[PDB]
Amino acid sequence: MSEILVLNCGSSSVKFALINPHTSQSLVTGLAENIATKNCKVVFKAEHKIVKYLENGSYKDVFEMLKDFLVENKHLEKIVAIGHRVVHGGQYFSKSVLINADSLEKIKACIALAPLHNPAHIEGIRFCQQIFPELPQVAVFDTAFHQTMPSYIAEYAIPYELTHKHNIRKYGAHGTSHKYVSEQAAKILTQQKANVIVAHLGNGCSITAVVDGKSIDTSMGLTPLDGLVMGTRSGCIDPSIFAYISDNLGWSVTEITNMLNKQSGLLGICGHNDMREVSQLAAKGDSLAKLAIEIFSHRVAKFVASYMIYFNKLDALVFTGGIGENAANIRKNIISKLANLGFMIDHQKNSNSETFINSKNSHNIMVIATNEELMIAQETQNLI
Amino acid sequence: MSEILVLNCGSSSVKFALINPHTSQSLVTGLAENIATKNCKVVFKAEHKIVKYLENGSYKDVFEMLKDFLVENKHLEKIVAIGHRVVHGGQYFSKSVLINADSLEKIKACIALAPLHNPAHIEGIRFCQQIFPELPQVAVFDTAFHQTMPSYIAEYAIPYELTHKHNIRKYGAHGTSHKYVSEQAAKILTQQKANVIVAHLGNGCSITAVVDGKSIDTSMGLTPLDGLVMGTRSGCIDPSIFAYISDNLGWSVTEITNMLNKQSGLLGICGHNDMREVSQLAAKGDSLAKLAIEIFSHRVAKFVASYMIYFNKLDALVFTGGIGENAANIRKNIISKLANLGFMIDHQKNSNSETFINSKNSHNIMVIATNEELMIAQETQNLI
């Protein structure tokens, strides 16, 4: 009957789920958003949906409302631990860990590496210590899975001292998703270990080569900004743009970096960050939306192609994430761009988002739902 | 019997060659260095090498000395035109052009794209207008060849206004070498234009996908900093490194960019920028030199793999440039990493850098010497 409270704390949002690790069931899921604004609200999804508005609600208010809900609905007594999604564990963590003085010190040190992510994770952990004092807590790092990437792949071609004294290298992210999905792939294919390429396509997008079950290369970088085109993130770009923009427009590094993270990607190209809206606009003939789809899909194809280098035999190309799981048109586009590499879609299977969507003469092409919350619950249960 | 004078006019240097476009023969080559300093000197290489020192010689003094040499050795009368290398032609130039007020205006508008070179190119042209008034002049752009890249490939995923108002996109470079080499490959391979991937590996390194003789994708970006690992340039790196260094170490955009351009690449990794010295050190057992070679070679292999998407049938992978033409160990290492993609080297053919260096069961792998000065002479001849 034990449950794990799973959290993903963001700058103005808290995503939560109550999961039974023994049954793998998600009993309650929810999302607080627009925190610290007049539009603050918390959506609870249990048997039925309940939306609770809290004008000007703070992060602490949100946690108190979450606790109130757990108490009133008699979940608090069943909860044995809290698992936190933490984006960046730097070179410190290659697996999940209990939250205590040491791990917290390290998570704090990694703020430098993921300044747009780790502060909120830590704030969440602190609220939980205050509000659920007697529960053990676990951190599950989106960089952990990628810690197996070898130096010749992960390191950049920069001064030794920057690499080693300042820990600058490729870390990747979405690790929990890539781990969960690649393990699911091996299970479905009845393999002990997966040899797959996993494309996690959602608001953020990344892709990872998994060889014998371990990440060997991945698209995000020092931070989740790098690699694929995303909702508001640029992904790959010539570092020369900093000097160019600074010299010519006078923007600061902070301003340029904010633009790459918040005003770029699909949003920058066509004016919409939501791929669903972009698809609908493109279908109606919007030229920029159509272009955004081409740039997005072509870059995914280029990464898949590049990762073929790692495989004597590729078990499967796997789609996951909000877009990967649901957007048949995007999967079709990416696969059409991979025709020369022996990938081919079965349109009927694709339209239904089946587990396998490839035709007969093609590498396996799979659609697998990610479940980061369940993975976090399991990682957490393992440590208590 | 006619001759073309080929120039690369830099801020403190003039590289020159006298070429017969019809016989393809380079009659004289040379380099003026340290112009307007105590150590100003001009090297002339014809039958033998001659070094002429000219303490504090002006850029104008250099040109008069060049003229004097061409008069004294009876070359001047045979010269029919002057071809100028221009590093960046933006979106204005997709081919070589005769120099006139119009084209000069356009070149001037590209200054922001190459702020340290395009001015020196222009000044050199003006010196030539004064000193060789009778001769037609042609500009040949390192960026022109890549102007066939389609927008969904060349554009970054950034705000529309940055792309279009401010011309921020991938331009690539080494265009004159990629064009010349793919042209040579076409003469050797089949009846049609070449379908080849060209890896130009020298002090700068870039790789290009050429389909039916036209560039469709290439590794350098806005400037020649991006893409492959090079002697002192980082190539690809997470843009997030700017905020990290600026915020944590307090460096300026200029200092960070200088670091990526001048202290990175092989030099940054192992302490040596010259690939020959890196190879020699690695061969004696230096593990960092070995790592530098692994990082360098793997990145080339990743780009080759990524470019496979463009080809129904790849005609050849082609190595060129100072390293590509001469470094058998480096080519062997790169092809080694491409084993899963059906590339295999023949060691004895590789040892002599033969036209074909692949073994029996392999895509074609070639070594073709580049000759950018000849290409500039041919482009120039074509317009006069």
Side-chain angles (χ1 to χ4, degrees), chain A residues 112 157 160 166 217 222-223 226 234 238 240 244 253 264-265 268 298 302 305 309-311 340, chain B residues 157-158 160 166 217 222-223 234 238 240 244 253 264-265 268 298 302 309-311 337 340:
Chain A
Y160 184 95
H166 300 279
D217 197 351
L222 178 67
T223 80
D226 210 7
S234 64
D238 182 348
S240 308
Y244 180 90
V253 164
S264 296
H298 177 79
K302 279 183 66 184
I309 197 178
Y310 300 114
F311 300 97
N340 284 330
Chain B
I158 61 186
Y160 182 96
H166 300 107
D217 201 351
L222 183 72
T223 81
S234 66
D238 184 344
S240 306
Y244 181 87
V253 177
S264 299
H298 183 72
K302 277 178 69 179
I309 62 167
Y310 302 114
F311 301 96
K337 288 174 166 53
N340 295 321

mmCIF file of all heavy atoms in Angstrom, chain A residues 112 157 160 166 217 222-223 226 234 238 240 244 253 264-265 268 298 302 305 309-311 340, chain B residues 157-158 160 166 217 222-223 234 238 240 244 253 264-265 268 298 302 309-311 337 340:
data_model
loop_
_atom_site.group_PDB
_atom_site.id
_atom_site.type_symbol
_atom_site.label_atom_id
_atom_site.label_comp_id
_atom_site.label_asym_id
_atom_site.label_seq_id
_atom_site.Cartn_x
_atom_site.Cartn_y
_atom_site.Cartn_z
ATOM 1 N N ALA A 112 25.402 25.957 -10.845
ATOM 2 C CA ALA A 112 26.295 26.589 -11.806
ATOM 3 C C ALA A 112 26.166 25.935 -13.169
ATOM 4 O O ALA A 112 26.262 26.603 -14.193
ATOM 5 C CB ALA A 112 27.727 26.504 -11.325
ATOM 6 N N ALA A 157 36.397 20.170 -27.448
ATOM 7 C CA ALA A 157 37.791 20.449 -27.798
ATOM 8 C C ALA A 157 38.179 21.848 -27.320
ATOM 9 O O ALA A 157 38.231 22.802 -28.110
ATOM 10 C CB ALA A 157 38.006 20.311 -29.305
ATOM 11 N N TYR A 160 42.355 21.970 -21.507
ATOM 12 C CA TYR A 160 42.323 20.993 -20.421
ATOM 13 C C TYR A 160 41.773 21.583 -19.124
ATOM 14 O O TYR A 160 40.946 20.970 -18.452
ATOM 15 C CB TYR A 160 43.737 20.450 -20.181
ATOM 16 C CG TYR A 160 43.837 19.357 -19.139
ATOM 17 C CD1 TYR A 160 43.820 18.023 -19.507
ATOM 18 C CD2 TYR A 160 43.969 19.659 -17.789
ATOM 19 C CE1 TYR A 160 43.927 17.011 -18.561
ATOM 20 C CE2 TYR A 160 44.074 18.648 -16.826
ATOM 21 C CZ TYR A 160 44.049 17.328 -17.226
ATOM 22 O OH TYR A 160 44.152 16.309 -16.295
ATOM 23 N N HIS A 166 37.054 23.177 -14.290
ATOM 24 C CA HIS A 166 35.729 23.783 -14.282
ATOM 25 C C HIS A 166 34.596 22.851 -14.734
ATOM 26 O O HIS A 166 33.453 23.279 -14.896
ATOM 27 C CB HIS A 166 35.753 25.085 -15.077
ATOM 28 C CG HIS A 166 36.716 26.088 -14.525
ATOM 29 N ND1 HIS A 166 36.416 26.888 -13.445
ATOM 30 C CD2 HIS A 166 37.989 26.389 -14.874
ATOM 31 C CE1 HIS A 166 37.456 27.652 -13.164
ATOM 32 N NE2 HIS A 166 38.424 27.368 -14.016
ATOM 33 N N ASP A 217 26.137 8.297 -26.312
ATOM 34 C CA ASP A 217 26.167 9.675 -26.833
ATOM 35 C C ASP A 217 24.755 10.243 -26.691
ATOM 36 O O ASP A 217 23.797 9.480 -26.682
ATOM 37 C CB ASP A 217 26.624 9.646 -28.305
ATOM 38 C CG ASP A 217 27.095 11.006 -28.829
ATOM 39 O OD1 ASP A 217 26.924 12.026 -28.141
ATOM 40 O OD2 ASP A 217 27.621 11.053 -29.969
ATOM 41 N N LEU A 222 26.237 20.732 -22.034
ATOM 42 C CA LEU A 222 26.518 21.173 -20.678
ATOM 43 C C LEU A 222 25.184 21.360 -19.980
ATOM 44 O O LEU A 222 25.028 21.031 -18.799
ATOM 45 C CB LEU A 222 27.279 22.505 -20.719
ATOM 46 C CG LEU A 222 27.642 23.163 -19.384
ATOM 47 C CD1 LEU A 222 28.654 22.317 -18.653
ATOM 48 C CD2 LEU A 222 28.188 24.574 -19.609
ATOM 49 N N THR A 223 24.216 21.887 -20.725
ATOM 50 C CA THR A 223 22.864 22.117 -20.217
ATOM 51 C C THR A 223 21.871 21.597 -21.258
ATOM 52 O O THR A 223 22.272 21.256 -22.368
ATOM 53 C CB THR A 223 22.589 23.628 -20.018
ATOM 54 O OG1 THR A 223 22.278 24.216 -21.283
ATOM 55 C CG2 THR A 223 23.797 24.339 -19.422
ATOM 56 N N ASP A 226 21.292 22.547 -25.612
ATOM 57 C CA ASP A 226 21.965 22.082 -26.838
ATOM 58 C C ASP A 226 21.225 20.956 -27.580
ATOM 59 O O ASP A 226 20.380 20.259 -27.009
ATOM 60 C CB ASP A 226 23.404 21.625 -26.514
ATOM 61 C CG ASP A 226 24.372 21.830 -27.684
ATOM 62 O OD1 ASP A 226 23.981 22.439 -28.700
ATOM 63 O OD2 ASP A 226 25.522 21.374 -27.587
ATOM 64 N N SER A 234 16.919 26.844 -28.968
ATOM 65 C CA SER A 234 17.547 26.787 -30.289
ATOM 66 C C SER A 234 18.156 25.430 -30.628
ATOM 67 O O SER A 234 18.202 25.043 -31.804
ATOM 68 C CB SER A 234 18.670 27.817 -30.360
ATOM 69 O OG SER A 234 19.706 27.500 -29.441
ATOM 70 N N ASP A 238 26.142 27.914 -33.928
ATOM 71 C CA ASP A 238 27.543 28.353 -33.996
ATOM 72 C C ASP A 238 27.811 29.287 -32.816
ATOM 73 O O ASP A 238 27.107 30.280 -32.654
ATOM 74 C CB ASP A 238 27.771 29.082 -35.336
ATOM 75 C CG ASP A 238 29.217 29.547 -35.543
ATOM 76 O OD1 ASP A 238 30.020 29.537 -34.591
ATOM 77 O OD2 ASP A 238 29.552 29.949 -36.681
ATOM 78 N N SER A 240 29.921 31.389 -32.565
ATOM 79 C CA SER A 240 30.260 32.708 -33.106
ATOM 80 C C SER A 240 29.131 33.725 -32.950
ATOM 81 O O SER A 240 29.365 34.936 -33.027
ATOM 82 C CB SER A 240 30.635 32.612 -34.594
ATOM 83 O OG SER A 240 31.625 31.636 -34.821
ATOM 84 N N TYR A 244 29.051 38.040 -32.538
ATOM 85 C CA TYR A 244 28.368 38.742 -33.617
ATOM 86 C C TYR A 244 27.227 39.612 -33.069
ATOM 87 O O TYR A 244 27.113 40.800 -33.394
ATOM 88 C CB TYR A 244 27.858 37.756 -34.667
ATOM 89 C CG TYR A 244 27.141 38.435 -35.808
ATOM 90 C CD1 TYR A 244 27.834 38.846 -36.942
ATOM 91 C CD2 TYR A 244 25.781 38.685 -35.744
ATOM 92 C CE1 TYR A 244 27.187 39.477 -37.987
ATOM 93 C CE2 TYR A 244 25.121 39.318 -36.788
ATOM 94 C CZ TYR A 244 25.832 39.711 -37.907
ATOM 95 O OH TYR A 244 25.188 40.338 -38.948
ATOM 96 N N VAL A 253 25.745 38.687 -22.652
ATOM 97 C CA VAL A 253 25.724 37.216 -22.689
ATOM 98 C C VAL A 253 24.426 36.670 -22.082
ATOM 99 O O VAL A 253 23.851 35.703 -22.583
ATOM 100 C CB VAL A 253 26.962 36.599 -21.969
ATOM 101 C CG1 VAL A 253 26.755 35.115 -21.661
ATOM 102 C CG2 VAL A 253 28.214 36.788 -22.799
ATOM 103 N N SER A 264 13.649 31.099 -28.913
ATOM 104 C CA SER A 264 14.153 30.426 -30.093
ATOM 105 C C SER A 264 13.341 29.160 -30.396
ATOM 106 O O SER A 264 12.162 29.090 -30.068
ATOM 107 C CB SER A 264 15.644 30.141 -29.927
ATOM 108 O OG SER A 264 16.380 31.364 -29.839
ATOM 109 N N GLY A 265 13.951 28.172 -31.043
ATOM 110 C CA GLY A 265 13.208 26.949 -31.349
ATOM 111 C C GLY A 265 12.008 27.201 -32.252
ATOM 112 O O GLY A 265 12.020 28.144 -33.047
ATOM 113 N N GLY A 268 10.757 30.828 -32.057
ATOM 114 C CA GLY A 268 11.531 31.780 -32.830
ATOM 115 C C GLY A 268 11.279 31.668 -34.322
ATOM 116 O O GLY A 268 11.200 32.680 -35.017
ATOM 117 N N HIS A 298 14.354 17.664 -39.818
ATOM 118 C CA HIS A 298 15.632 17.410 -40.470
ATOM 119 C C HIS A 298 16.735 17.258 -39.433
ATOM 120 O O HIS A 298 17.607 16.395 -39.559
ATOM 121 C CB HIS A 298 15.975 18.529 -41.454
ATOM 122 C CG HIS A 298 17.314 18.359 -42.101
ATOM 123 N ND1 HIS A 298 17.528 17.493 -43.153
ATOM 124 C CD2 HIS A 298 18.510 18.938 -41.840
ATOM 125 C CE1 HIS A 298 18.797 17.548 -43.514
ATOM 126 N NE2 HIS A 298 19.415 18.415 -42.732
ATOM 127 N N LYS A 302 19.180 14.078 -38.872
ATOM 128 C CA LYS A 302 20.629 14.173 -38.877
ATOM 129 C C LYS A 302 21.265 13.515 -37.653
ATOM 130 O O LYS A 302 22.306 12.871 -37.755
ATOM 131 C CB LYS A 302 21.083 15.629 -39.021
ATOM 132 C CG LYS A 302 21.050 16.097 -40.474
ATOM 133 C CD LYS A 302 21.562 17.501 -40.624
ATOM 134 C CE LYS A 302 23.044 17.597 -40.293
ATOM 135 N NZ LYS A 302 23.421 19.032 -40.390
ATOM 136 N N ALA A 305 20.944 9.673 -37.966
ATOM 137 C CA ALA A 305 21.959 9.245 -38.918
ATOM 138 C C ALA A 305 23.333 9.187 -38.297
ATOM 139 O O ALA A 305 24.072 8.231 -38.509
ATOM 140 C CB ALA A 305 21.982 10.168 -40.135
ATOM 141 N N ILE A 309 26.541 5.251 -36.282
ATOM 142 C CA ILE A 309 27.943 4.898 -36.169
ATOM 143 C C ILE A 309 28.197 3.900 -35.033
ATOM 144 O O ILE A 309 29.159 3.131 -35.075
ATOM 145 C CB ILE A 309 28.779 6.168 -35.932
ATOM 146 C CG1 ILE A 309 30.253 5.919 -36.228
ATOM 147 C CG2 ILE A 309 28.578 6.687 -34.512
ATOM 148 C CD1 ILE A 309 31.099 7.155 -36.064
ATOM 149 N N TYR A 310 27.325 3.911 -34.026
ATOM 150 C CA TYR A 310 27.524 3.104 -32.823
ATOM 151 C C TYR A 310 27.030 1.659 -32.907
ATOM 152 O O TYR A 310 27.278 0.877 -31.988
ATOM 153 C CB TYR A 310 26.862 3.774 -31.619
ATOM 154 C CG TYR A 310 27.421 5.150 -31.332
ATOM 155 C CD1 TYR A 310 26.637 6.277 -31.482
ATOM 156 C CD2 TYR A 310 28.738 5.308 -30.903
ATOM 157 C CE1 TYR A 310 27.160 7.557 -31.221
ATOM 158 C CE2 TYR A 310 29.265 6.552 -30.644
ATOM 159 C CZ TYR A 310 28.468 7.675 -30.795
ATOM 160 O OH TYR A 310 28.998 8.921 -30.528
ATOM 161 N N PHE A 311 26.348 1.303 -33.990
ATOM 162 C CA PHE A 311 25.626 0.038 -34.036
ATOM 163 C C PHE A 311 26.067 -0.936 -35.131
ATOM 164 O O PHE A 311 25.947 -0.651 -36.315
ATOM 165 C CB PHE A 311 24.116 0.302 -34.150
ATOM 166 C CG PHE A 311 23.560 1.102 -32.999
ATOM 167 C CD1 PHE A 311 23.383 2.479 -33.112
ATOM 168 C CD2 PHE A 311 23.243 0.477 -31.795
ATOM 169 C CE1 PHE A 311 22.894 3.219 -32.056
ATOM 170 C CE2 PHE A 311 22.733 1.212 -30.724
ATOM 171 C CZ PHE A 311 22.564 2.592 -30.857
ATOM 172 N N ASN A 340 17.055 7.018 -46.929
ATOM 173 C CA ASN A 340 18.324 6.538 -47.478
ATOM 174 C C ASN A 340 19.087 5.624 -46.521
ATOM 175 O O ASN A 340 20.013 4.927 -46.929
ATOM 176 C CB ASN A 340 19.207 7.709 -47.924
ATOM 177 C CG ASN A 340 18.742 8.312 -49.230
ATOM 178 O OD1 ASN A 340 18.170 7.613 -50.065
ATOM 179 N ND2 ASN A 340 18.990 9.609 -49.421
ATOM 180 N N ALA B 157 17.461 27.640 -35.538
ATOM 181 C CA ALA B 157 16.149 27.752 -34.906
ATOM 182 C C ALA B 157 16.150 28.898 -33.901
ATOM 183 O O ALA B 157 16.189 28.690 -32.678
ATOM 184 C CB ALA B 157 15.772 26.443 -34.233
ATOM 185 N N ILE B 158 16.123 30.108 -34.440
ATOM 186 C CA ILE B 158 16.210 31.345 -33.667
ATOM 187 C C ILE B 158 15.144 32.316 -34.180
ATOM 188 O O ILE B 158 14.459 32.016 -35.168
ATOM 189 C CB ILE B 158 17.601 32.003 -33.823
ATOM 190 C CG1 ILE B 158 17.874 32.367 -35.284
ATOM 191 C CG2 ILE B 158 18.696 31.115 -33.241
ATOM 192 C CD1 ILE B 158 19.309 32.897 -35.539
ATOM 193 N N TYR B 160 12.978 34.857 -36.121
ATOM 194 C CA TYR B 160 12.912 35.301 -37.514
ATOM 195 C C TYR B 160 13.777 36.537 -37.799
ATOM 196 O O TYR B 160 14.505 36.585 -38.789
ATOM 197 C CB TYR B 160 11.447 35.608 -37.878
ATOM 198 C CG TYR B 160 11.252 36.032 -39.311
ATOM 199 C CD1 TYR B 160 10.882 35.106 -40.281
ATOM 200 C CD2 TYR B 160 11.440 37.354 -39.700
ATOM 201 C CE1 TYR B 160 10.702 35.481 -41.597
ATOM 202 C CE2 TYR B 160 11.267 37.736 -41.019
ATOM 203 C CZ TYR B 160 10.898 36.794 -41.961
ATOM 204 O OH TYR B 160 10.719 37.156 -43.273
ATOM 205 N N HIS B 166 19.255 40.368 -39.588
ATOM 206 C CA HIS B 166 20.660 40.386 -39.199
ATOM 207 C C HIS B 166 21.497 39.283 -39.844
ATOM 208 O O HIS B 166 22.683 39.146 -39.548
ATOM 209 C CB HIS B 166 20.794 40.402 -37.671
ATOM 210 C CG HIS B 166 20.151 41.598 -37.035
ATOM 211 N ND1 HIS B 166 18.966 41.526 -36.327
ATOM 212 C CD2 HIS B 166 20.504 42.905 -37.041
ATOM 213 C CE1 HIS B 166 18.635 42.730 -35.899
ATOM 214 N NE2 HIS B 166 19.548 43.586 -36.320
ATOM 215 N N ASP B 217 24.931 20.592 -47.437
ATOM 216 C CA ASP B 217 25.120 20.777 -45.992
ATOM 217 C C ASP B 217 26.623 20.869 -45.753
ATOM 218 O O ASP B 217 27.405 20.336 -46.525
ATOM 219 C CB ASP B 217 24.505 19.597 -45.230
ATOM 220 C CG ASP B 217 24.198 19.910 -43.754
ATOM 221 O OD1 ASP B 217 24.599 20.972 -43.221
ATOM 222 O OD2 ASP B 217 23.564 19.045 -43.115
ATOM 223 N N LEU B 222 28.145 30.311 -39.115
ATOM 224 C CA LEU B 222 28.214 31.736 -39.440
ATOM 225 C C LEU B 222 29.636 32.092 -39.837
ATOM 226 O O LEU B 222 29.863 32.792 -40.828
ATOM 227 C CB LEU B 222 27.796 32.562 -38.219
ATOM 228 C CG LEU B 222 27.726 34.092 -38.326
ATOM 229 C CD1 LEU B 222 26.534 34.496 -39.171
ATOM 230 C CD2 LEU B 222 27.597 34.681 -36.928
ATOM 231 N N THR B 223 30.596 31.593 -39.058
ATOM 232 C CA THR B 223 32.018 31.794 -39.332
ATOM 233 C C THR B 223 32.729 30.441 -39.386
ATOM 234 O O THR B 223 32.108 29.411 -39.131
ATOM 235 C CB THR B 223 32.686 32.645 -38.240
ATOM 236 O OG1 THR B 223 33.000 31.812 -37.118
ATOM 237 C CG2 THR B 223 31.785 33.805 -37.808
ATOM 238 N N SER B 234 37.603 25.208 -31.421
ATOM 239 C CA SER B 234 36.800 24.204 -30.734
ATOM 240 C C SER B 234 35.857 23.409 -31.634
ATOM 241 O O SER B 234 35.556 22.245 -31.355
ATOM 242 C CB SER B 234 35.951 24.894 -29.667
ATOM 243 O OG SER B 234 34.989 25.752 -30.272
ATOM 244 N N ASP B 238 28.322 23.547 -26.857
ATOM 245 C CA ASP B 238 27.044 24.024 -26.298
ATOM 246 C C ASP B 238 27.186 25.538 -26.122
ATOM 247 O O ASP B 238 28.165 26.010 -25.517
ATOM 248 C CB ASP B 238 26.810 23.335 -24.942
ATOM 249 C CG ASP B 238 25.475 23.680 -24.304
ATOM 250 O OD1 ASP B 238 24.816 24.668 -24.699
ATOM 251 O OD2 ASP B 238 25.089 22.940 -23.371
ATOM 252 N N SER B 240 25.715 27.308 -24.220
ATOM 253 C CA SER B 240 25.631 27.588 -22.779
ATOM 254 C C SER B 240 26.975 27.874 -22.133
ATOM 255 O O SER B 240 27.028 28.323 -20.980
ATOM 256 C CB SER B 240 25.027 26.398 -22.035
ATOM 257 O OG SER B 240 23.793 26.025 -22.582
ATOM 258 N N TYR B 244 28.131 30.276 -18.667
ATOM 259 C CA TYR B 244 28.867 29.596 -17.621
ATOM 260 C C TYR B 244 30.201 30.293 -17.311
ATOM 261 O O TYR B 244 30.501 30.620 -16.162
ATOM 262 C CB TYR B 244 29.091 28.125 -17.964
ATOM 263 C CG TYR B 244 29.832 27.415 -16.858
ATOM 264 C CD1 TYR B 244 29.146 26.862 -15.786
ATOM 265 C CD2 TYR B 244 31.214 27.339 -16.863
ATOM 266 C CE1 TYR B 244 29.813 26.228 -14.765
ATOM 267 C CE2 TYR B 244 31.891 26.704 -15.842
ATOM 268 C CZ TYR B 244 31.181 26.150 -14.797
ATOM 269 O OH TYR B 244 31.840 25.519 -13.771
ATOM 270 N N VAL B 253 32.734 38.309 -23.529
ATOM 271 C CA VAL B 253 32.394 37.621 -24.770
ATOM 272 C C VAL B 253 33.618 37.531 -25.677
ATOM 273 O O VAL B 253 33.860 36.507 -26.309
ATOM 274 C CB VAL B 253 31.282 38.342 -25.556
ATOM 275 C CG1 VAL B 253 31.011 37.620 -26.871
ATOM 276 C CG2 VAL B 253 30.022 38.425 -24.745
ATOM 277 N N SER B 264 41.784 26.516 -28.276
ATOM 278 C CA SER B 264 40.980 25.303 -28.187
ATOM 279 C C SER B 264 41.425 24.278 -29.233
ATOM 280 O O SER B 264 42.591 24.249 -29.601
ATOM 281 C CB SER B 264 39.489 25.659 -28.324
ATOM 282 O OG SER B 264 39.112 26.526 -27.259
ATOM 283 N N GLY B 265 40.518 23.427 -29.706
ATOM 284 C CA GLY B 265 40.916 22.405 -30.675
ATOM 285 C C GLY B 265 42.026 21.507 -30.129
ATOM 286 O O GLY B 265 42.100 21.283 -28.914
ATOM 287 N N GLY B 268 44.074 23.069 -27.308
ATOM 288 C CA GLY B 268 43.399 23.047 -26.020
ATOM 289 C C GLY B 268 43.433 21.678 -25.367
ATOM 290 O O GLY B 268 43.712 21.552 -24.173
ATOM 291 N N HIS B 298 36.655 11.039 -34.100
ATOM 292 C CA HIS B 298 35.259 10.667 -33.849
ATOM 293 C C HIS B 298 34.300 11.737 -34.344
ATOM 294 O O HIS B 298 33.234 11.440 -34.891
ATOM 295 C CB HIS B 298 35.033 10.433 -32.366
ATOM 296 C CG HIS B 298 33.646 9.985 -32.044
ATOM 297 N ND1 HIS B 298 33.184 8.723 -32.352
ATOM 298 C CD2 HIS B 298 32.615 10.633 -31.455
ATOM 299 C CE1 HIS B 298 31.926 8.612 -31.964
ATOM 300 N NE2 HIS B 298 31.560 9.755 -31.411
ATOM 301 N N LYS B 302 31.359 11.195 -36.977
ATOM 302 C CA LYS B 302 29.967 11.549 -36.703
ATOM 303 C C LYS B 302 29.319 12.408 -37.806
ATOM 304 O O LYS B 302 28.147 12.203 -38.143
ATOM 305 C CB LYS B 302 29.816 12.229 -35.330
ATOM 306 C CG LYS B 302 29.723 11.215 -34.192
ATOM 307 C CD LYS B 302 29.623 11.870 -32.839
ATOM 308 C CE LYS B 302 28.290 12.575 -32.658
ATOM 309 N NZ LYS B 302 28.249 13.183 -31.305
ATOM 310 N N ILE B 309 22.511 10.606 -44.825
ATOM 311 C CA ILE B 309 21.093 10.813 -45.161
ATOM 312 C C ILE B 309 20.864 11.377 -46.556
ATOM 313 O O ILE B 309 19.794 11.162 -47.136
ATOM 314 C CB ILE B 309 20.358 11.763 -44.190
ATOM 315 C CG1 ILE B 309 20.991 13.159 -44.225
ATOM 316 C CG2 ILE B 309 20.307 11.197 -42.791
ATOM 317 C CD1 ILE B 309 20.129 14.218 -43.533
ATOM 318 N N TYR B 310 21.841 12.111 -47.090
ATOM 319 C CA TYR B 310 21.642 12.796 -48.379
ATOM 320 C C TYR B 310 21.841 11.923 -49.613
ATOM 321 O O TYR B 310 21.639 12.390 -50.739
ATOM 322 C CB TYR B 310 22.553 14.017 -48.511
ATOM 323 C CG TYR B 310 22.357 15.031 -47.411
ATOM 324 C CD1 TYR B 310 23.373 15.288 -46.485
ATOM 325 C CD2 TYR B 310 21.155 15.731 -47.291
ATOM 326 C CE1 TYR B 310 23.190 16.209 -45.464
ATOM 327 C CE2 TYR B 310 20.965 16.655 -46.276
ATOM 328 C CZ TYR B 310 21.980 16.891 -45.366
ATOM 329 O OH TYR B 310 21.787 17.814 -44.359
ATOM 330 N N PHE B 311 22.228 10.667 -49.424
ATOM 331 C CA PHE B 311 22.679 9.878 -50.563
ATOM 332 C C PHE B 311 21.926 8.576 -50.760
ATOM 333 O O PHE B 311 21.927 7.713 -49.884
ATOM 334 C CB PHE B 311 24.183 9.578 -50.432
ATOM 335 C CG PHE B 311 25.038 10.813 -50.353
ATOM 336 C CD1 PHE B 311 25.433 11.321 -49.126
ATOM 337 C CD2 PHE B 311 25.448 11.464 -51.513
ATOM 338 C CE1 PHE B 311 26.229 12.470 -49.060
ATOM 339 C CE2 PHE B 311 26.228 12.612 -51.457
ATOM 340 C CZ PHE B 311 26.625 13.109 -50.231
ATOM 341 N N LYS B 337 36.481 4.239 -37.217
ATOM 342 C CA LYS B 337 35.273 4.601 -36.479
ATOM 343 C C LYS B 337 34.009 4.502 -37.333
ATOM 344 O O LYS B 337 32.900 4.577 -36.818
ATOM 345 C CB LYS B 337 35.436 5.994 -35.856
ATOM 346 C CG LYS B 337 36.429 5.969 -34.684
ATOM 347 C CD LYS B 337 36.746 7.345 -34.128
ATOM 348 C CE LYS B 337 37.452 7.228 -32.767
ATOM 349 N NZ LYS B 337 38.668 6.343 -32.790
ATOM 350 N N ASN B 340 30.910 0.447 -38.833
ATOM 351 C CA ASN B 340 29.518 -0.012 -38.862
ATOM 352 C C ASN B 340 28.722 0.545 -40.036
ATOM 353 O O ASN B 340 27.586 0.124 -40.286
ATOM 354 C CB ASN B 340 28.798 0.293 -37.544
ATOM 355 C CG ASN B 340 29.384 -0.472 -36.375
ATOM 356 O OD1 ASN B 340 29.745 -1.644 -36.507
ATOM 357 N ND2 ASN B 340 29.467 0.183 -35.216
#
